[PDB]
Write a protein that binds this ligand. Structure first.
Ligand code: OE0
Ligand code: OE0
Ligand code: FBP
Ligand code: FBP
Ligand code: FBP
Ligand code: FBP
Ligand code: OXL
Ligand code: OXL
Ligand code: OXL
Ligand code: OXL
Ligand code: K
Ligand code: K
Ligand code: K
Ligand code: K
Ligand code: MG
Ligand code: MG
Ligand code: MG
Ligand code: MG
Lengths: 436, 425, 425, 422
């Protein structure tokens, strides 16, 4: 109690009852479980991103606006169904719904567009249809590709090649859907930007009772690697027809978050279901509760010991900033990023503080939704003559956006992470600031 | 051998951290140990057939639940009889006979405050018909448990009371309820309506953890494999749910509509068996045992002291089983609370105790039917040999295996105090 | 059941701490030691401690092992010392429940490349005179231990070889030396000349830790209470040194000139006794036993499995003692390696084993001289009660206390497999 | 080759038992000696030429025992020490500051004695940096010493000597009002049983480490070196164990004040401390210090833990911190980093007083303030790099953590930077 006594007198006894704080202060995992309280409300913003599959039930511009308000971060286009003309209309409807909020840049929410490929099917390499669908994604500016049935590192190289020179910035999330993919996992993850645990096909290729081992191992290996991991298929399946999910479904969503999944997905739930906005609201509600129940004491310590020593200033500054954020119960970590890399390196250490990422890249702002706990802000202002002043304006943009969105209150402490010179890869500074 | 250390997630359990443990989980690592989490199957039209109950017993059913919300007393007496007929059809081979507990799930107080009039009549029925367990519905305070204990009368003293926590008051008064109950049931169906649906997993995880700490059984209930009522295979969320209830530390898992009225009752039991076996191998025993050890308070009870010594000994030699003689099941329960990887093979002459130990994870009851030998230590050895022969026949033991034998210094319950290291010959 | 006063003594609040930093902060100088002194005291016999009457005073002060330095004195001189020690020890053998055995150790002169001619003659002398231990000087490699082992003629294979690590070669070849030795001695005198004086503490701490991991005795030797040769009280560095050797994990502590030629031989023994008692209470058993537990490999030896089960059981009930029946001292040694807080009362019929177990920390030997009983189980029982009766008489046990009893299933060495939880009546 | 030195295999161990087993006598210490050495000044160590040798041997703090000698005697000692220290001021990149500490006579049979009030006023008039207040029994005793220093003796550090049973029992109230503690084992070994002193030492060191306040281990550390050129096996063990316990400072009383080998006793304490610091199990030490330290909303406190964590991640050669009062360097020190805390200060008093904190290497900056504050900071950081390069702490290619503030004055430390040397 001596390690909380002073901050208890300062922040109050009511602060330390919320967001499962008594449970996270526990010395053991058994004590942590015993200290979980249903009356302990989550205060932090929802960090696990929600991928919603776009279909007939969620294609209208007006419906898409409701899903954005409900918590949709990434829009998935399943290229197994629909024509190129159909998917181009979906992309346009999504962009129209997202840009309807651009009038207020302090409260604008970027939404990523992901292309889920049909797959190789009976074939060995990349199918002819996949090459055409990938060329479509490049021409239409998709941010992510969920490459279906990845079975080796050569499969991911084929997808990167089909994207061409212009599709270099697109993120490749390899869907592990069969036994070969599970066995060659380490070689696949090495060449991928992240992974997707495609439980539907995986539950047919391997025994249904073994899928949870594959999900847990893949999530843990992705967490170790610092790369995003998506949990997919049948998460809230009953919500396709019913307004409330089963006890197994709510348990499943919460357990995917507890395992360490960066993203959670809705397939039929939002693409063809009667309750698409309600499925997004439900995933948001469960994720918020599950994230508070994460045992950060052992999680951070294990992530820290497992991570190898590094001489990269971005990597060093990231662990220093996350450690600083935990020490003062920082409301947020504000980071300036160009490619999203600095925000990704903060994210891998799983801080309780929100990683508010300020970027000028619209693509990077959409793609950082793949990383848990990263809240992107798109800076639209033109560059100042003095670089040091341009940096200060972006930091103030992050504070004003964070104050307006409820992340920051006056009196709160924030960690600011910046670089010494412009251009990607020079992040090396950490500042402790008091919100005034 | 090298082959032994690749099975039952042994590389994953040897890991120094939980993150390393997760990364070392192998889908090609097959489970070796017997399924420890017991399966409760609700009895209804789909599962009352004597021939069907035999198939469910073979599939892995350990406890038969009678839902007193549906049916008359005449209906439930026919269920009890059909279950007993199916269970006793295997009594001809005592080395492979599997005891099955009968549990009475009460209707509940509903609008009322105390124990309803129907519940008092249903509880008296349970006593008259020899039920082993009671799942008392909508327990809100310790006085509710006392009312159930009182309705059971003097003859229902041996019956176990598992308090169903189905509402917010029960979740808040949990500590006082668990103190007076024999165990708990996380009744997720009503709980998911009384409290926000998105908070039920916190209540499940807290209750399971508190029960694990207390050394009392905890059942995870409702909608575990719901789609198996109509479909031959479950959803990805359903298999995940079953596995996560086992990983959380649930002693029992339950089937309601999946076995009461569904099209796949035997298939539902086989599925819960298959998932539990996988999930139990994936349990991180290194931290689990260490935390259970540290958390458990000091004790001057020889049964309690012998239990921790035996579990520690079982871990040191990778014991295939811990064979314990128990009259009331208590010795077996105290071994179980430390979550050993070794099976707790419990030999008992009490048919009621043999049925009731299914509530404790990892306890495999054996009913000894032979009459007592004149020389006590000879009778004790015959029981230990019965446990070895049963374990050999059922696949738990092989020649060359090491086994921990837990016994007492004199006849009668409460005198366990000895732990022996034995080599299977 | 024990009281608030029990939990304030023997640094019990400090041992319950969750961290080592918290453990240090909870050390109380007002917390008095209750347990008996476990770290054994080796006293060098010389002109200052050779008389039968002086030896009786040193036995009463706490001397467990008598060291004969073969660097000084003739074979006739050392034979008279052996006879005087045996006469002083047997003067108390009329009251067998309270009789204390004392080991005799021969410290060799030293090598030259191989075993010297004088060492071969001195080792033959040790065998002919029934010495229990040999402190082999300047061991540099495993071949040196084999030469001493070979020199312990045909009769002396039972003698324990404690390898003195006195130079850089011994420190580097440590693993191969410890593998073939019965234990080690950190001979700091010569080691402080062969290697930089400021590096000796690293060698001491590494060697003690490796011996603790191996389960073999480790002696801390030279200049522990050097000022007590001339002065009646030691320096602040000397008391700190003795306490830190105990805290590091040393099984034995030694007095060279302090006892052999000094002015205060009985006072140096009393001082080492006083400091060791304090230091043992301050040991952080929570992390010590958990690390010893994890570091020790899995074993399929019933003696090794029973030992960890018994120490775990002893800790759970705060057992006053662990009574182990041993013939070679092995079972007591395996209990000792897990560093229990309970005294290991070892009952043996071997006078040599009774003397040699003083090398193991926390082992209190009892030589049992009684005529054997016709029924082996009754003979087992008489020795267990002999251990309790002696324990009661010496202050280790009271009626109501809990004890752990380790025995085997059949007579003869190497069959230890039972652990019983007994209440002292 | 880097990973075989400074007990790096032993520090990477998953358990403390494995850590002990991995200690290598052939693993040489590379880092600079962090535990500061206090040397008592007497007849054997009073000459200006003798003092210069002790400064070169490793003396960081000079103790004046006011139990022996007159005010005129001690003023001559102060002057001789200052003359010996300032003889090296010609090269500011290699100049070593030396603190002057006044050890009071004590209350004896008696509150604060009349002689102590006179000796404390002497210390103020002569600019002493530290006071070792003898026989502190309660918090009111510390308040009496603070009062006897007056309005001129505000910046003086008070190290309370715990020498009796009452002081050990009232420890928490004494430490709360003191700047640090001294485990005065000589009198403590007479007031309490000799066999219980190690419990008091270990508890006090641990409580000081938890509090983030300096702790000195004192008396009979190398006692045999008063007459002999080499210490006993118990003495080398004792010095090493005081460092291993977590003592910020180690002391030499008769060993330097009246002993035949004063320079040799300083060299011996330096040699043992260097070895003992490498053998510190940082894995569990840092983790326990981190968990035990309470949450803080002070940016200096938050930046300190962030910087130490960053230093461990890259195996930083040093942490360079810009400090006015020594507080920022003290907060880095409490987390026991393996990287040297190179503290750049303009205060000469602060530079002398940071020797009380383990691992802090003070540098006195003697250049005038620049017009642009941004450039004045960069010059002090470069002074720290050049001093560190010259003194062997840094090489080109090494990584350093730089800790600065956002605005001048004390208490505004809030920035951490990862820098690559040259
Ligand atoms: O040993 S266990 O199986 N699991 C322990 C554990 C430890 C750390 C974390 C946080 C975490 C979460 C995800 C991670 O990938 C990761 O590195 C750390 C979770 C669980 C266990 C289960 C139930 C109990 O009651 C109990 O005492 C022990
Ligand atoms: O129980 S023990 O005495 N504690 C070990 C321990 C652990 C960490 C540190 C470093 C440390 C960490 C944090 C501190 O605050 C601090 O003062 C020191 C030192 C000692 C022990 C355990 C296992 C053994 O094999 C053994 O010989 C002894
Ligand atoms: O995350 P990335 O891709 O490394 O971008 C972080 C970059 O942001 C900065 O803080 C400023 O970026 P820009 O000037 O390019 O907009 C750099 O110092 C740093 O290199
Ligand atoms: O677990 P319980 O019910 O306490 O039963 C343990 C008891 O069983 C025994 O092992 C065997 O005794 P019985 O011969 O009465 O069955 C007793 O020695 C011990 O007291
Ligand atoms: O410690 P040791 O040398 O292995 O001997 C222990 C032996 O002592 C016993 O407990 C009793 O046997 P004895 O009667 O022959 O002494 C054995 O059963 C056990 O094997
Ligand atoms: O150690 P202290 O007393 O807190 O002072 C640290 C100070 O060092 C600085 O980095 C530089 O200080 P000055 O400019 O006053 O010399 C400040 O920003 C900070 O306030
Ligand atoms: O493609 C998918 O999402 C799957 O197979 O689960
Ligand atoms: O009775 C039950 O199992 C429920 O309500 O969930
Ligand atoms: O012989 C010894 O013990 C020594 O040299 O230290
Ligand atoms: O004054 C002191 O330092 C002592 O007595 O040890
Ligand atoms: K698809
Ligand atoms: K019911
Ligand atoms: K000798
Ligand atoms: K003095
Ligand atoms: Mg698929
Ligand atoms: Mg209900
Ligand atoms: Mg020698
Ligand atoms: Mg004094």
């Amino acid at each position: 109690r001596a390690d909380v006594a002073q901050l208890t007198q300062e922040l109050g006894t009511a602060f330390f009852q919320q967001q499962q704080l008594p449970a996270a202060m526990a010395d053991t995992f058994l004590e942590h479980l015993c200290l979980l309280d249903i009356d302990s409300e989550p205060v932090a913003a929802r960090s696990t991103s929600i991928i919603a599959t776009i279909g007939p039930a969620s294609r209208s511009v007006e419906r898409l606006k409701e899903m954005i308000k409900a918590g949709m971060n990434i829009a998935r286009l399943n290229f197994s169904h629909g024509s190129h003309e159909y998917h181009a209309e979906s992309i346009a409807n999504v962009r129209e719904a997202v840009e309807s909020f651009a009038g207020s840049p302090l409260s604008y929410r970027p939404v990523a567009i992901a292309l889920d490929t049909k797959g190789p099917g009976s074939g060995p390499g990349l199918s002819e249809q996949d090459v055409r669908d990938l060329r479509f994604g490049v021409e239409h500016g998709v941010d992510i590709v969920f490459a279906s049935f990845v079975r080796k590192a050569s499969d991911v190289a084929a997808v990167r090649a089909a994207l061409g020179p212009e599709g270099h910035g697109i993120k490749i999330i390899s869907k592990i859907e069969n036994h070969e993919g599970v066995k060659r996992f380490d070689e696949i993850l090495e060449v991928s930007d992240g992974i997707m645990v495609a439980r539907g096909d995986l539950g047919i290729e391997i025994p249904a009772e073994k899928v949870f081992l594959a999900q847990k191992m893949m999530i843990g290996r992705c967490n170790l690697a610092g790369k995003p991991v998506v949990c997919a298929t049948q998460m809230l399946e009953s919500m396709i027809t019913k307004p409330r999910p089963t006890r197994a479904e709510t348990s499943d969503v919460a357990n995917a978050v507890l395992d360490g999944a960066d993203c959670i997905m809705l397939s039929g739930e939002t693409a063809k279901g009667n309750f698409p906005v309600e499925a997004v609201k439900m995933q948001h509600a469960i994720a918020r509760e599950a994230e508070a129940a994460v045992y950060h004491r052992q999680l951070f310590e294990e992530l820290r010991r497992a991570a190898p020593l590094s001489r990269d200033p971005t990597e060093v500054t990231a662990i220093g900033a996350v450690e600083a954020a935990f020490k003062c119960c920082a409301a947020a970590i504000i980071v300036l990023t160009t490619t999203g890399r600095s925000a990704q390196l903060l994210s891998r250490y799983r801080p309780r503080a929100a990683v508010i990422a300020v970027t000028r890249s619209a693509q990077a702002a959409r793609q950082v939704h793949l990383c848990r706990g990263v809240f992107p802000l798109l800076y639209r202002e033109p560059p100042e003559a003095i670089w040091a002043d341009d940096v200060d304006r972006r930091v103030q943009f992050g504070i004003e956006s964070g104050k307006l969105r409820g992340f920051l209150r006056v009196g709160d402490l924030v960690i600011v992470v910046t670089g010494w010179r412009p251009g990607s890869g020079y992040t090396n500074i950490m500042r402790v600031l008091s919100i005034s």
